[PDB]
Amino acid sequence: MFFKDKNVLIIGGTGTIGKSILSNVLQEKPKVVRVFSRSEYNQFLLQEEFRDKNRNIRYLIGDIRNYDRVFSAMENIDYVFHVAAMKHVSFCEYNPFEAVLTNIFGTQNVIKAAIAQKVKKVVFTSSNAAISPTNNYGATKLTAERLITSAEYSKGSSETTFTSVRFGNVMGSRGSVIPLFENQIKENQKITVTDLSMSRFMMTLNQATMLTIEAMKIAKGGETFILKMPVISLNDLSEVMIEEVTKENIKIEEIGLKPGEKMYEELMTHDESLQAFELPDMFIIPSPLAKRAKAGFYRSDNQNAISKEELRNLILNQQLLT
Amino acid sequence: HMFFKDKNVLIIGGTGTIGKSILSNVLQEKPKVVRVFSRSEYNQFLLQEEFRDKRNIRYLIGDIRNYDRVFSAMENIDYVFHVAAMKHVSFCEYNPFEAVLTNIFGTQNVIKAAIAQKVKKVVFTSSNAAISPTNNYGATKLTAERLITSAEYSKGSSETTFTSVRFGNVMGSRGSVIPLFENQIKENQKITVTDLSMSRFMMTLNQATMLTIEAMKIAKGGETFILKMPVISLNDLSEVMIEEVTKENIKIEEIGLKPGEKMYEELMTHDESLQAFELPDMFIIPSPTQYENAKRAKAGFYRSDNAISKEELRNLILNQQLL
Amino acid sequence: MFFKDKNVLIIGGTGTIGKSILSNVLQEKPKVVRVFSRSEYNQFLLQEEFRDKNIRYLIGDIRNYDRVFSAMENIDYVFHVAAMKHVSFCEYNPFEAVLTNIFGTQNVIKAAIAQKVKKVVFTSSNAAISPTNNYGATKLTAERLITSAEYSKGSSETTFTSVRFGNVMGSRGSVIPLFENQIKENQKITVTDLSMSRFMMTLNQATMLTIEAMKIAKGGETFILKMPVISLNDLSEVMIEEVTKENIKIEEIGLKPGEKMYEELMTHDESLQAFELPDMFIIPSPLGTQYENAKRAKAGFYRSDQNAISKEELRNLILNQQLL
Amino acid sequence: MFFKDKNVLIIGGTGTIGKSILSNVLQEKPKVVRVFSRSEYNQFLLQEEFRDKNRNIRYLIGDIRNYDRVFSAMENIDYVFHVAAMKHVSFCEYNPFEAVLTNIFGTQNVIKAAIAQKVKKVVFTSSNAAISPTNNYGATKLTAERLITSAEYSKGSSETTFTSVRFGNVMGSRGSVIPLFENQIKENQKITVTDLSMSRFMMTLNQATMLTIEAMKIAKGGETFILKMPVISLNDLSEVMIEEVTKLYGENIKIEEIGLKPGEKMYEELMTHDESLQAFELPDMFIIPSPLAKRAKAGFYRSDNQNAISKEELRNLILNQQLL
Amino acid sequence: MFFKDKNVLIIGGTGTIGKSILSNVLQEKPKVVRVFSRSEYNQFLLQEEFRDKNRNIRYLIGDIRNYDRVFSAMENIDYVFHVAAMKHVSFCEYNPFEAVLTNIFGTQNVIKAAIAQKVKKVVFTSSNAAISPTNNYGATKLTAERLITSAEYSKGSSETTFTSVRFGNVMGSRGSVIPLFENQIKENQKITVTDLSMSRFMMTLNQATMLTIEAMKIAKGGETFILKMPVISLNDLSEVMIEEVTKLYGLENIKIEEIGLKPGEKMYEELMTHDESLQAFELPDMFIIPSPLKAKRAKAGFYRSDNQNAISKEELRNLILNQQLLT
Amino acid sequence: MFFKDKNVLIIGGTGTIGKSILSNVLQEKPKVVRVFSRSEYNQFLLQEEFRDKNRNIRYLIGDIRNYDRVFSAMENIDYVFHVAAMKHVSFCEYNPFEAVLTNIFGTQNVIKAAIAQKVKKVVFTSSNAAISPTNNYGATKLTAERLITSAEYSKGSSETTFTSVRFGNVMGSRGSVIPLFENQIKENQKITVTDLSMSRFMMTLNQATMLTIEAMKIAKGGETFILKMPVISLNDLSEVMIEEVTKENIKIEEIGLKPGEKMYEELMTHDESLQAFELPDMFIIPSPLAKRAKAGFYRSDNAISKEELRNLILNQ
């Protein structure tokens, strides 16, 4: 229905999530989709993969740090998926200003080009790290989320609607723990662990993709979407993983804790739970500037983690192994 | 006249509550110069006519957003105080990119110019807002804190030293509740109350001033100094204000929460408490070094969530000349 | 009448004249007024002073184009009131004065054209005429910026007018509040050169002059109000007299660097073009517009330099607008 | 030996030539090697590849379009390997301004920042495609080569040294024809072939890696080193690539004519004729001195104008290195 | 005809080709023509030279490195001629980042500004140096040429058209060999010869002017127009120049000093790569190369100045005389 | 003497005064002179003129709106002549912000790059148009002059010292009245006159060259040098010109005032006469942050006669 005959930009289209959004949107036969990123090699690989489907896809090389390039990329465009970002906790500690240029300054650049190019809607892909952040990456997402909600509230005349979406661990994404364990087994027969008492809300690629695309379609403006998500144990994941890659003399090595890392991650602040709504599969938090959700602390701490066996089925079902 | 005697000092943000206090404390120690750096000529004027006889000061108008101006402001300077910021919570939610500019991009400029001009020590003035933040201001100050942390790691060949200092509410500061409620009664016999069940760590002007001067004096880089503080309930504050300002059929309006406001504040994260040192009056969180008789902290949480009494708060206000 | 349900932006609205314009404009029931200034403490206090009375508050620096651009989003009328106004400060920090007064004034013009703003009224000074200091040179360059924009408009409909004041009595960081608070505290007064003279004006006078140009102007004009001349000599005695309610030190501080001994309403060369209303001079751009009640002005100088108002008149002025 | 307890930056250290240069420098026990790349996920892989050798390495995220970030990466550094670029002919024609930012504007940021941080040497990693180019990519290298010679000539009093090295096809390097053909056979069983009569000068990874390190150690500044490389027909390569990839996995496989991509050259050249008139020869190398020991013969050094290798030597070469 | 009552910007109208375009565009009687140049003294001369014709002409001081100023010069303008550049081979090798700013970064500013102001068409003025170049100058012109084609390809929904023209040595144009040799002969009685064996494609000022103006009128967008031009030997040129400059000022026994090549100089020039000659169209007096990114077909082969017969000495002399290239 | 074995940059060295400084400086046999300007064409002409003296001279293309280029141009330089500017009254009126970039914003660039490259002295070339200015150009030189002073006053630790020099009309300079009339007579026989009742202090090319080079050699910092100049009548100039070029049916056209123009020019404000010093052929105005000058207004409001003028012109 929704995207048929429209002009879409996907900023970060070579990344785990951008590629997933591309091909679902492509099924609605859109007039065009434009993939925006910095790295030619990754666009090269993208081009090849879409060999015979490539008529209605276009590949811009650009950096979201550069305004005039965001702007040109945003010409005659209806929908902007803003999915570019520095996502690694450690990299955004060792390089904390670099994290700012991409996540914060890049966001203002995206916002501002969307106002000027009279874009219809913009969907910002945030994280549960933005809640009560222990690290610079999360600080930059909390700032970016403030940037997006401000944009909506001070629009003025603009017809451009601004929205956020909020992820937890997208399972098996670029640089994530699941591929790194799968690799470290096969090659080294040694796993690299931080702290097995750690906790995370996690979610499938499609879960993350559908949230985002549903957001484009339903988004009113100034709101945040948070999917209802299962908690996963880092102990459970390590054992379930070491087992399933074998198809069992692996040495679990304890490396410690990467700078900034949070022991647990939270879907929303308690203060947000006070104004937040509850749908079947998802929460909606309206702009700070129709069913009520239960007030409280939605931590991964507080949730019964799914059991080793329920987790095992989840990995093998979504096929996160090469 | 020990440490600063005949040295060259830059107070960036020196026109303001805390910058002015540092200015007069540092000045007793007989420094060779103190450069006061600030954007607004009205404030430089006012402060300049306050010191008409106290010769030792240069007054530089400029903006920490402009690196070039920060760079020349640091020329031949021994000790920088980075006190400039946007400090209201509400203003950083409604003008959130403006906050990034002053609080983040501005803090880089300090770090980059200090390195380039071979400054001896830089001291950043942060908030307990930067712990487990609920608002853009808090996040910007956490990011700034990490900029200061990283700058100390990446130093390289540089001798320049980067330190943070972390405050809670400096009682009676520019744009704060104690002046507000006072002047709201005076004029409109009305109080604007947000949520009376809020709690804050709060401190005196002198407390924050000496904390910042102490860290400047003894820091080798990487640390974060926190003075331990009385906890203050807003419910008691409202009452004690209505009582003492009258000297009492005064309206109490409930504006409600301003956006992004946090119900309590926190001196440090749980992970920080794991490496924290304890002193009698203070905490020192080191970087990922010995201090005169400091035990290791009690790990755990440091939330304002138990408050000082109403007659204590009365005294604290009255003895401070806050009215 | 004029501002009813229209959209207004006051660049520099926290300040002496900014606030004065703000609330005059608000009386005409305008759809919104956006206040634009940098300093959050000042927006805060003003926010509290308009706690019932429709007003967006934006933090921004005119040195940043992008911020000024979004400030003018969908706006009809703009008041460009922000500058550095101290003479001493613009000599001691001269490049900072270029940034706010010149570069910043571009950003307004450029952004107003960009967002198709209906009218812009620039607040200038007597200082811009035959200037002896950087500030006045910045205001001269501002003025020519504004005139040029109006000429090279092209297809644009944005109109650019200048307004040109003299000392707005009791404005932020000026001598009347200074001397008052100098006596009260120090029993001392800082006097520069007592044979100085100034055209000076009321806060409301300068407010109405600026609201006039908004309503009336077709672009290119520089409006100057006719103004009483005031001796500093007389001001200093009158001040020492009224603030006491006995013996008070009068310190010779001397000239602050760059200061002019007298001020001028227009250049001689402008008097050859100038129009004359009863209480106003309008200088049309060099480039045949009709104003009502207007005859041609008389060629010559318009210096303050002999015909100063009396102490009697002056103390009456200072006492009547409650300036203490 | 040379790099012992030195500080080294590899601008572009994550990709093919950067990684190979890194591990070769590491065997001489330098104090530190820094690695400068934009993409955190490529640094994440490299960082994991050097699991327990890492104490010597630092990982810097940054862009050479950013002077300030290039500058801080150069702090107290002795040796710079400028290896970052857009290197794809197609991408550089469809995004030519991007190519200008990284290949030219970055090269100057490098020059300017090395001068400012008092680096010893900078080796610029250019292509033979900058000679009589038919594309933007080549034009950026020509310009970049021309920036490197200009820095040297007007050094003034800088001790910093500037040199270029000039590769032809580095076999198997990220996003090039050999891994594409293997992959195209594996997944689809089609090879995609532009124009089969194209010829290319091709070198191995270590031929390149050691060209750049030699240059690093030996250069007197303003020079250009190029390695004598064998020619390879694309006729032979495509044939050889199917033969061998089919063997490894399971040769009745399609060949699809694509024709040229925009700006693709038919052959490449190591130096223009003019360069050939003042270049020096060593057994395995040519050295062009600055435009601003044994001397070569003139002529047209092209892939055109030199006998290729045989199918068999080509296959042999491919086997001793890069399949998957 | 075409420019009747239109608005025109000649970015670089103070120079040789920009002035000639100005006066040619002026006879079709447009609403306004704007001149955009950095140098006030050059504008001052032009101003004074157009004593009574100045009324539909405006004089905008400005720099194409400045986007914002390129922007406002283009306001509500219909036809942009981008004729500004550093065009000296030697200068662009010794100041190559300056060449980048003026020749590349400035071309982008034009492109970006022209799209933003909804201009109708733009004609970029390239050189035949862009073909298989041996210098930074020709490096930047290839790149500029490339920016122009890219603009067109991804226009998007912009109606703004982009086209390149492509010149050879424009005779008597500012800072060129002919006024140099004349003046050298006058003032030091000896010329400076790089390398007499060099050959060059050379066109008249009117050939250059008409080429550009035609491409303004005709161009669909993304094409490249090149004029069939005669080859000139520098041997003949140096000889002819000494003869005729002597005949005038009344002096032919004057020194000839071999300087050798300046850095980056090419021996011959080329109108197009061989590759381009396989898609290019021939007209009587002109080739049209279409866009490489998206009616008579020309012959293939290498169109060089060493690969085509010069004019004779005597034809050259006729030319140099009839073009009034002496003073 | 003073410039032997030194490294001199001349910013704007292709134009009237810039060149005059180049060749005088060259007699003192410096190690190097760098000529810095925007225009390749003008450098080209300058390279040809100096063809057999050019080992000493370097030729940089750069715009003083661009810091990094001014900076690199300043590498290892001892003395900087800041002679580049937008100088026409009219061009600075129609193009007012362009004039700010070059005159004001350019000057900050020189100053800031001078401090960084530890340049020994910097001499700024201003105009008496800066006094009580009627035009934007005047506004921008008064602002520039201030910048230079402010740079000296807040140096801090730098050894770089900043100095200004104030010209009136440099006779026969680029784009000026005398070359315009000489050309206008021969080709058209119309002179184009603004207001014949105008007034100007005027000075020889040498005068201004020597003022500037002296300021290099002597200057302590923060001072302005003004040379004692003769006043010339635009009536006397227009006739003297027509007579000598014709050497007289040459019609005179009154075009009127171009925008911004001042009827007279002034060596200093009254306010500066209160602090200025006098010398044989010069005034010295010290930093607002030796013989006293007589106070009063140094307006061009006695002129030199028709005959003294004619001698001045024919003597060059």
Ligand SMILES: NC(=O)c1ccc[n+]([C@@H]2O[C@H](COP(=O)([O-])OP(=O)(O)OC[C@H]3O[C@@H](n4cnc5c(N)ncnc54)[C@H](OP(=O)(O)O)[C@@H]3O)[C@@H](O)[C@H]2O)c1
């Ligand atoms: N002449 C030839 O033989 C020849 C052959 C092939 C191609 N071309 C091309 O033809 C074009 C014109 O050649 P031409 O012979 O007429 O050159 P020219 O006489 O030097 O003209 C150059 C023009 O551009 C202006 N300019 C230079 N830099 C500028 C900047 N940054 N911003 C704005 N304006 C600038 C110049 O005036 P100011 O210096 O006053 O700013 C002048 O108006 C050039 O693009 C060149 O590449 C020429």
Ligand SMILES: NC(=O)c1ccc[n+]([C@@H]2O[C@H](COP(=O)([O-])OP(=O)(O)OC[C@H]3O[C@@H](n4cnc5c(N)ncnc54)[C@H](OP(=O)(O)O)[C@@H]3O)[C@@H](O)[C@H]2O)c1
């Ligand atoms: N002539 C007088 O009567 C007089 C009177 C008062 C003051 N002055 C002052 O004396 C100085 C020189 O006057 P002049 O007669 O020599 O003028 P001029 O002949 O026009 O010389 C101007 C010089 O500055 C260069 N230039 C212009 N803009 C530039 C920029 N953005 N970046 C770098 N270089 C630039 C010019 O180079 P190009 O080759 O690029 O054009 C040229 O070399 C100026 O500061 C002027 O204001 C002169």
